[model samples]
Target: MYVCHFENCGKAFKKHNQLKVHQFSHTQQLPYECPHEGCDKRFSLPSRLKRHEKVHAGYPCKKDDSCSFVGKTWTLYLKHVAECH
Candidate 1:
C-alpha cells in the first residue's frame, strides 16, 4: 500500500496514479465544482464530487432517535447509522 503523504490523510492506495490524484486535494485548488443549482461547493477530486452530490439527494435517516444522523443519500445515512450506532 502506498501511503498518502498529505497531512492528516493517511489513506493507502495500491496505485501511484490514484495517490497522485488524491494529492491534488492538498494543493488548495478545487477544480471540480458541484453541478446542482445554487451550489458553490468545490472539490479537488472527482470522488468527492460524487460524494457531495448526495447532499442534494434529500434523503433523511430515520434509523433511530438517539442517532438521528441525516445523510444526503439513503446509502450514506444507513452506512453511518449501522457503523456509528
Candidate 2:
C-alpha cells in the first residue's frame, strides 16, 4: 500500500501518483488550472478540472441560446439565466 507519509494522514493508495495528489491535500501548495481558451479556472483537485473540461467538450451544456454562460448541466443553466440574464 502506498500510504501517505504525512503526519496523521495515513491514507493509502494503490498508485504512487495517487499518493502524490493526496500529498497535495496536506500542503495545499499546488492547484490545477484549465489550460483551455477563455475560462482559466483553477481547482484544488484534478477530478474537478477533469469534470469542468467536460463542459468545454460540449457535454451537458444547456442554454447557450439565451446567454453567454456555458456549463455542465440543465439545472445549472436554469439557475444561472434566472439571475445572470
Candidate 3:
C-alpha cells in the first residue's frame, strides 16, 4: 500500500490515480481549481483541499492539547509550532 509523504495526511492509496493526486500536496502544486467566486483557492492534493474548506466552514482546529487555535486555515499550524518551539 502506497502512502502519502505528508506527515499529517499519510493516507494509503490503492489506485495509481489516487496516489498521484495525494502526492501533489507534498509538492504544493495546485491544479484542481475551485469554482467559488473570488475564491482562488485551488488545491494540489484532495486531502489538503478538504482541510482548506474546513476553514470556510468555521471549523475549530486544535493543534495541541488545551490550546485553542482559532482559524479556518493553516494558521492553526502555527499554534502547533508555537507549542513545540
* Per-model RMSD to reference: 10.6, 12.2, 10.8
lDDT of 2 by residue, 1-85 (tens): 8987556679999999999887877656437768897764667789988977886864333445545467467676666767663
Question: Per-model C-alpha lDDT, please?
Answer: 0.75, 0.70, 0.65
Residue-wise C-alpha lDDT for candidate 3, range 20-68, written one tens digit per residue: 8877765566675565577767777778787766666753545556645
On the 0 to 100 scale, the lDDT of residue 73 in model 1 is 68
**TM of each candidate vs. truth:** 0.39, 0.36, 0.33
Model 1, span 1-85: residue lDDT tens: 8888555689989998888888777656878878988876778899999878865676555666665456766688668867874
lDDT against true structure, model 1? 0.75
lDDT of 2 at 67: 51
RMSD from true fold, candidate 3: 10.8
Q: Ranking under TM-score, best-scoring first?
A: 1, 2, 3
Q: Which pairs of residues collide in model 3?
A: 55-72
In TM-score terms, candidate 3 sits at 0.33
